[PDB]
């Protein structure tokens, strides 16, 4: 999900209109520059099918959903990412002992507090208290 | 850390530029690694050699 952040440059380049959304004039300009000539109705109904609002203003979530549909990410990696995102109650990409205890209690797989601290220090390899994605994957490896 | 046995060099490596290099001895690397077993697994699985 977060890997799509690199798409910002392509989004800015395609949004030649500068209004934060695509424009038929800019699309025609890039079309003429590249020399192809699809139908005006073809480009219009493509814009209508892509854009969630459909009123010409093609927003980011349209291309985001297109990329998500095309990705078909691996089930295991998707499960790991979802588990991290739901364990991180803040969703910022950080796992804390409080968040781990809260998610364990909510899911019913509660453990004693010493066991929670023990699980934190298992993943903790750099020794600063944080638990990250590769630490999570190393824990998942068994 | 995997082979644990010394071996002879199959080839020759020569400089063409003014170069700066950092070198590590096998024994001390192994000792630090076996002390920090936790980092050892991640180091082994992440590190890949060029040749």
């Amino acid at each position: 999900e977060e890997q799509i952040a690199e798409f910002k440059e392509a989004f800015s380049l395609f949004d030649k209109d500068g209004d934060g959304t695509i424009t038929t004039k800019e699309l025609g300009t890039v079309m003429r520059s590249l020399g192809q000539n699809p139908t005006e109705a073809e480009l219009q109904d493509m814009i209508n099918e892509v854009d969630a609002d459909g009123n010409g203003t093609i927003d980011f979530p349209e291309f985001l959903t297109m990329m998500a549909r095309k990705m078909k990410d691996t089930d295991s990696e998707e499960e790991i990412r979802e588990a991290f995102r739901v364990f991180d109650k803040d969703g910022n990409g950080y796992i804390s002992a409080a968040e781990l205890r809260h998610v364990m209690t909510n899911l019913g797989e509660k453990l004693t507090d010493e066991e929670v601290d023990e699980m934190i220090r298992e993943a903790d390899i750099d020794g600063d208290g944080q638990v990250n994605y590769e630490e999570f994957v190393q824990m998942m490896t068994a | 850390w995997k082979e644990a046995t010394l071996a002879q060099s199959c080839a020759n490596v020569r400089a063409l530029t003014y170069c700066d290099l950092h070198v590590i001895k096998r024994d001390a690397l192994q000792k630090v690694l076996e002390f920090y077993t936790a980092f050892s697994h991640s180091f082994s699985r992440n590190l890949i050699l060029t040749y």
Binding site: F7, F14, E26, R32, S33, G35, K70 | L16
Partner: protein, 102 residues
């Protein structure tokens, strides 16, 4: 583009390759895709190398392919000067009319 490189001993030792994407300008092709327009957008977003400084003026013009190929080819044709030292490792040169002090 390909360019083998000679040697100071008048031998030839090395082959040099260069590559570039033209997907956004060639015909659209898709073996499997979520949608045709989505595949087109993804290919165009992959064509960023050409879409960059090498062709940033394109949206202000039309039928730019007549000059885009030459613009891309010039940066590779410049490699002939790079082929000059011919694997040799040697001291750099100094300008004439300025004489070595020693």
């Amino acid at each position: 583009k390909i360019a083998p490189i000679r040697n100071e001993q008048d031998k030839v030792v090395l082959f040099l390759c260069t590559f570039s994407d033209i997907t956004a300008f060639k015909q659209p092709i898709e073996d499997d895709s979520c949608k045709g327009w989505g595949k087109f957008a993804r290919l165009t977003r992959a064509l960023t190398s050409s879409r960059g400084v090498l062709q940033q003026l394109a949206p202000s013009v039309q039928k730019g392919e007549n000059v885009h190929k030459h613009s891309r080819l010039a940066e590779v044709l410049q490699l002939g000067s790079d082929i000059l030292p011919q694997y040799k490792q040697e001291a750099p040169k100094t300008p004439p009319h300025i004489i070595l002090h020693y």
